[PDB]
Amino acid sequence: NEVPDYHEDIHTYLREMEVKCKPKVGYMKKQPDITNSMRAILVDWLVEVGEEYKLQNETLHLAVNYIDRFLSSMSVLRGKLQLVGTAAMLLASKFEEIYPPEVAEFVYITDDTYTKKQVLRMEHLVLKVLTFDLAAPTVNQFLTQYFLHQQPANCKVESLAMFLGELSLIDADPYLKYLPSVIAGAAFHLALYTVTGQSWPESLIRKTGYTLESLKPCLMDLHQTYLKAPQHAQQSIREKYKNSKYHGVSLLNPPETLNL
């Protein structure tokens, strides 16, 4: 379809950058006041916000990247965590969207917990801390590349892979342990296997150097997350992916075994 002239160059570049743009894996243990559970509540809320404003999934993924990098070097009290998230979503929207919501919308969606002044000051601080390095690789960026290797393309597989990649955003333990390209790999394989019974294609071993064996640790975690998704405290991604835009893929029954 699209001529693939720069596809390999870009893949290579993204593989370099995902290592550099990675947050610090154990950062939460050094936060005195916030926890992984609080982070999950924040990300789940950002899912809702993205739905309300009809934002791209990419924008959500970027915001999560910004948040984890910010919290990797800045101690934050629980009463300011939503401020960090809101400024992150604002910045992601400005980067990624054709029409980002205005700042007043970001204030509104917090029930006026913070002022416009506060959101704009936090924006400045997030930019400072991230040294304006906002063009981060995401799980979504790898997924869209992987989808070009379907035989043939399947809307349900794409939507289900997107769902699983998104679920990974919620749970810092375990998902901070894995790179975006690895989670995307596990998500794609699990989606393919669930919908069509197909597996990670040989063409993607060629492209990425990853095999089912190399993806296995992440795939085992993601399979458990998928199995347990209806019981998770956070449900916004499941609800989102029940809708027709996503072919109701969160209503599909997960495979009980992967036969690895």
């Binding site: 609080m38 739905e51 309300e52």
Partner: peptide
């Protein structure tokens, strides 16, 4: 708006 404003609550 469908989604109303919400102040997130972070209990222990």
């Amino acid at each position: 708006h469908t989604l109303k404003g919400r102040r997130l609550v972070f209990d222990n």
